């Protein structure tokens, strides 16, 4: 499946320029919104927005381009069609068969932060790692009851390589007998994950 | 601003002086690929995507030309207003949980990069380590600054204190983030 790109229009007659086309999908492709943005030194000066239907100046720099691009039917029609030829095409194709089908499973390991001593305070970490995609539920239990006091998780940590990571700490005191279980739920899992640590 | 998924097709970036360019595709935060402007091929971050999808790199190379023009036009049109340099911020963290003697990977997340010219290097006990360094490309932020992650593969031990050296015009002296 081949991917198409948004086509930068040509400007009319250290410094940083950036141009991007962005595709905003809601409920698959039942709602698609399309924005292209032209940025010069962290300031966006023109913009196509499919809700609006035509390039509009965001700043004073942007009037020349917007008024002209809108005047050429070959230019304007090219940009409007990018909602179908870039956004919808891509999602129905490339994305549907790659990222949208990606399911990488959580690696769940429990750890005690300081050597065990019954009737003494320690902290248990449940490292949940190498997963995709991001929607993940991670809860702690002592003996079957959800423990919410003394629990702290990291925010979702984006690894940068199409995997995510989250670390959930529990504060506790191991009594003799008790069972602590990390309870993980993730779309790549048939049934949830429970990992136990016998005190 | 509000959706389920956000694909950003066709992100192009161009800078002056020096004539630097980056062309990439992202989806839900992650880089699908970048076009190598010198080797003129599409480099997929996940190999297994490349075997199932594809992209004519000329699409990138053309876009970069357009931008190169537009930057040139826009420089003149604003009486050459230059970029305010920002101070960037490092964050080191392991990719896996640390187990002594088992090979892992250390990740340096560098954010608020602007402009996207940055030297990011690794120290181990204050000496240059480059064992299996992979750098990602500049990712875009909603405020038009950039982030970028380095990677260092290492064997964890006790006798190792690792640093993350980051150099940039927005920093008087180079900032080190210890781990």
């Amino acid at each position, epitope marked *: 499946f081949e991917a198409q790109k948004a086509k930068a229009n040509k400007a009319v007659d250290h410094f940083v320029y950036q141009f991007m086309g962005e595709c905003y999908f809601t409920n698959g492709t039942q709602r698609i919104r399309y924005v292209t943005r032209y940025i010069y030194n962290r300031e966006e000066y023109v913009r196509y927005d499919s809700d609006v239907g035509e390039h509009r100046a965001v700043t004073e720099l942007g009037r020349p381009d917007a008024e002209y691009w809108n005047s050429q039917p070959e230019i304007l029609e090219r940009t409007r069609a990018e909602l179908d030829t870039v956004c919808r095409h891509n999602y129905e194709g490339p994305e549907t068969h790659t990222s949208l089908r990606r399911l990488e499973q959580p690696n769940v390991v429990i750890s005690l932060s300081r050597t065990e001593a019954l009737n003494h305070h320690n902290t248990l970490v449940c490292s949940v790692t190498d997963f995709y995609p991001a929607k993940i539920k991670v809860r702690w239990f002592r003996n079957g009851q959800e423990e919410t006091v003394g629990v702290s998780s990291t925010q979702l940590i984006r690894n940068g390589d199409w995997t995510f990571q989250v670390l959930v700490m529990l504060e506790m005191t191991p009594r003799r007998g008790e069972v602590y279980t990390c309870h993980v739920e993730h779309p790549s899992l048939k049934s949830p994950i429970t990992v136990e640590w016998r005190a | 601003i509000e959706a389920d998924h956000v694909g950003t097709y066709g992100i192009s970036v161009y800078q002056s002086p020096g004539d630097i360019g980056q062309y990439t595709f992202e989806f839900d935060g992650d880089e699908l690929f970048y076009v190598d402007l010198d080797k003129k091929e599409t480099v997929w971050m996940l190999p297994e995507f490349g075997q199932l999808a594809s992209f004519d790199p000329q699409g990138g190379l*053309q876009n970069i030309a357009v931008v190169k023009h537009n930057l040139g036009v826009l420089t003149k049109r604003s009486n050459s207003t230059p970029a305010t340099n920002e101070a960037p911020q490092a964050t080191v963290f392991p990719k896996s949980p640390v187990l002594l003697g088992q090979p892992n990977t250390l990740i340096c997340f560098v954010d608020n990069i602007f402009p996207p010219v940055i030297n990011i290097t690794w120290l181990r006990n204050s000496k240059s380590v480059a064992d299996g360094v992979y750098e990602t490309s500049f990712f875009v932020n909603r405020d038009y600054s950039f982030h970028k992650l380095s990677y260092l593969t290492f064997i964890p031990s006790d006798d190792d204190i690792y640093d993350c050296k980051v150099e940039h015009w927005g920093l008087e002296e180079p900032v080190l983030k210890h781990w």
Partner: T-cell receptor, first 111, second 109 residues
């Protein structure tokens, strides 16, 4: 307008032939084709701006060069007989629906 | 690859000339025809995008057919001065064009 020079050239083998094309349209892209009976219009090299070039479908034997927005040259360093042909320049806008061709250059590379 | 047929075609004046063309790559979406008179360079004549099954300008029309990946240029009431070589190109996402071998057309008086 798109003007090529020379319009006709006779070169010997191993000889250097440089076809050049000028372009009044302020078009950003330029292209170099060759025409032959049995092959059609085949894209040799092309370009998006001064200082850049791109391989076309039959770039072997030819070296391109675009020193200007206006002008795009095609250089034949070691001219071989198989390069006897009719050469066409073209230009257009970024993503342009339309190409604008020059008149042509009849080139004979003889033995 | 883009393929036209025949290599050469001969039609009586006034009859309709049918010039066939077909393409491999289904990713293509733009199909301009160029017209080349002897001694001149080829020049855009008429064109179609693939979202459409027909484009009609004057005596020249293109009939397009995405499912069969086949393409067609009709010239009605042909005149002697319509005789030239006719190229079929294809474009994909607005990148460079790929032309076919070209069809010669002679209009007999």
């Amino acid at each position: 307008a798109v003007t090529q020079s020379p319009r006709n050239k006779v070169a010997v083998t191993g000889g250097k032939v440089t076809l050049s094309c000028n372009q009044t349209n302020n078009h950003n892209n330029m292209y170099w084709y060759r025409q032959d009976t049995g092959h059609g219009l085949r894209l040799i090299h092309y370009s998006y701006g001064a200082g850049s070039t791109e391989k076309g479908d039959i770039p072997d034997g030819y070296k391109a060069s675009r020193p200007s927005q206006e002008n795009f040259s095609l250089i034949l360093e070691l001219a071989t007989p198989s390069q006897t042909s009719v050469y066409f320049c073209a230009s257009g806008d970024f993503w342009g629906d339309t190409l604008y061709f020059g008149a042509g250059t009849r080139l004979s590379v003889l033995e | 690859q883009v393929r036209q047929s025949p290599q050469s075609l001969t039609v009586w004046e006034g009859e309709t000339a049918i010039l066939n063309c077909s393409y491999e790559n289904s990713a293509f979406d733009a199909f301009p025809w160029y017209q080349q008179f002897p001694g001149e360079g080829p020049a855009l004549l008429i064109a179609i995008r693939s979202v459409s099954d027909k484009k009609e300008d004057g005596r020249f029309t293109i009939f397009f057919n995405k499912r069969e990946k086949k393409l067609s240029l009709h010239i009605t009431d042909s005149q002697p001065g319509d005789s030239a070589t006719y190229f079929c190109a294809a474009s994909k996402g607005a990148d460079r064009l790929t032309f076919g071998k070209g069809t010669q057309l002679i209009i007999q008086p």
